[model samples]
Target chain A: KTISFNFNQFHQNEEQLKLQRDARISSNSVLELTKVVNGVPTWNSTGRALYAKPVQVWDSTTGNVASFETRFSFSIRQPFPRPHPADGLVFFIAPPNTQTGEGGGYFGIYNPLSPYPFVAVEFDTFRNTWDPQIPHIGIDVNSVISTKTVPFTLDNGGIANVVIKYDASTKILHVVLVFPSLGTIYTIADIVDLKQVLPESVNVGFSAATGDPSGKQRNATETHDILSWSFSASLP
Target chain B: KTISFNFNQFHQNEEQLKLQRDARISSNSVLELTKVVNGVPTWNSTGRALYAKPVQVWDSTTGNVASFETRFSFSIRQPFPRPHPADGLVFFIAPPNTQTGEGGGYFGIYNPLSPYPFVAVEFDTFRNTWDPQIPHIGIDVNSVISTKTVPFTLDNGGIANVVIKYDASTKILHVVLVFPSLGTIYTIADIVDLKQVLPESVNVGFSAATGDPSGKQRNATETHDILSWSFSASLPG
Candidate 1:
């Protein structure tokens, strides 16, 4: 049998070893994917953090390339009034054990000694030395270098729905952001050959890191709460 | 339930998915652990280069601590005479995705951008930038610097039995090498905590890289054949 996985059932009952075995948490303390708190597969608690669920994304038996589409709702809020709520999150497919990177600007995705064969679609909050001075959506390859990026931001309250899809045959990784209030869909695309850059199989997951607010956002809380997460090895 | 795996059945049949799924080959093509070549789980072909079998060594459900002991027999030989057979192999526990490093000098274990939180027991043959001039058994941690090393050489067509064990509670890793012909056992030990440096789970594997022979050893070859391998989650006795 070929490898196939889905995560929607966790929204109802979050206890299963299959899901737990396939997921990994890389935080300072003993942390895990928060059970249905705030009614979702939440990733943040009260402070800075990094978490991920990496799937073996390659089919080695057949060498048949697989494609995927993932959708989730993320809501970032400020517990206290401040200017910046810290950093954001990313939907990434990196090689195993990618959490060694420092959290702040790197999004816990990469570091100087980080291995190769990785890619990510970042939804960034705070602007760092390499950022665009504003919240943005970026496509990153091996390095923190963003081949393509767009400026975007969210206030403390609403939940933004995001859909990320990758097509192996066409070699395109696409991202779509939905703003329910405005009834609009913001879309972006980048051409990437998964076979050329990644191993036949890889780990797929999400990561978010928080930093001590510097200028005006001190005491600002950066919370990334996931309402739902759904992924399929098949793309439509 | 608590993450336990054993691979001693290679002496029999080799049809198990648990062993296949966790094992990955990083060579130039689709290569895997040879089932029973010469009645053994051999690691390489006659004249090819660069073969590795990195296994999923950590079980996250068991907290950030893990302990293991493995015993195996390996032999390195060359068909023709030469000063240096030009390369060697290493049994390593690295962060993950360790095959990304170049072969030859690094033993396919690391490169400049290789991640941290790793350790290895290297059976080196050639002298690279950081390697000692003589063939030796070295204990390496985060960097290429060998914490402790002992001179060693194997040119005769004979197999050597090796046993490596680690204790998480004591933070000690031990190695024992036995030369069958001489009936000698050379032992070494190092203090290391698998929990402090590595992730809750890591990749365990063997990497062998070949190199171009020098003028004297132009027809040299480094062949590593694995006779048997057995691993347990228990500490060594």
Candidate 2:
């Protein structure tokens, strides 16, 4: 018998209202992390936001790790047309209660000396000195450096669907980003060992950030919205 | 073997953002069903809003009807003072895909001439022809007429905690409303058969309405905010 759960957050029903109790949220008061505007839920509407499930779903107790797949749609839009839009978002797995990182190009997923292990797939929009000045997706392990990279664009205001799958047996993580309006699908993969990096249980969610013109940064009004998400544990 | 689940919706986390896709929502675009403003999930804000969970949690399979206990906190406030406020809110169980009812004194839970059964616990604020012209909580079944009722007043503006529990074997539903701010608790109970009144599977949610001054109705600006909710099927050993 397999003890698995299929969890879907539609942001259309009452069950999605439970996330406040079930997840850890770090966001500024002015620019909230979770907001329902025009009946749409924007995970990070403005400033740096971090949303992580509180319960650790992955168990490292057994020799065979649990495989899983998640699908979600997200949209990033500039609130106002500006020369530069501040930042992007990331989907990550880390130990529970992981604090957030700096904003701008960081995606709020990198914490230098955190005890819990962290791995992330970043959708980088704003370019930093270490990054290419274009919208791209990268696989990051414990650092902001990209191990694998591809360039994509939002092309005005449109939504992108992403499917991420992990095969425990093969120690492979596959990510697929689909842009419906742009008529494109981007695929990338990397081999990772959950047993070696993460603890017995790990949290999963998304982090996003916006930057200000202060210091060396360029400011633009931007919104990161996660429309819907579904996750299920799959057979190995 | 026992299968049980304990679910709590605190309306505080970023994860709660998924409700838009997981639930059924009907309301004017101006007034949203669920909103996280000031870090509170207001189920029904300034306009008429209805939010129903898409899943049918109670199953009629086998002999055992699932027993459940739900606790949530809500507040009804008059945004701007007026002689009268429009209406109030209701927590209800009806067949899936419940169309909203008439606002102002309807509590937004009525479905006339529908074969499917319905039951609701209503918190009424406005005074219609049938209302007692005060803040009150009532147990309603099939019709908006109250079978059991109690008078409740916020004494200004405050939050009220409510707990609704159903006992399968006894076919009884118990309700407890607590006002921690006012230091008071109200209790009510009613006999209902889930298997007889509701379908094998049913939807659970809340509906609220604001009214405009018309006919026998009086309109005042009001806000009903659902701060948090939790439901469980596990029975105490």
lDDT for model 2 comes to: 0.59
TM-score of 2: 0.42
Measured with C-alpha atoms, the lDDT of residue B233 in candidate 2 is 60
Local accuracy of candidate 1 as per-residue lDDT tens digits, B31-73: 2322223422222221211213334444455554556777767
List the DockQ of the predictions in order. 0.01, 0.01
lDDT (tens digit, per residue) of candidate 1 on A8-44: 3233233321122212322321222222234223222
Tens digit per residue, CA lDDT, model 2, A98-147: 56665556666665555346788888777778886568888888777787
Candidate 2, residue B142: the lDDT equals: 81
Cα shift from native, residue A31, model 2 (Å)? 12
Once superposed on the true structure, which residue ranges of model 1 sit more than 4 Å away at CA? A1-56, A59-63, A79-83, A97-100, A212-217, A234-236, B1-237
Error of 1 at A216 (Å): 10
Question: Among all windows of ten consecutive residues in candidate 2 chain B, which has the lowest summed lDDT?
Answer: B21-30
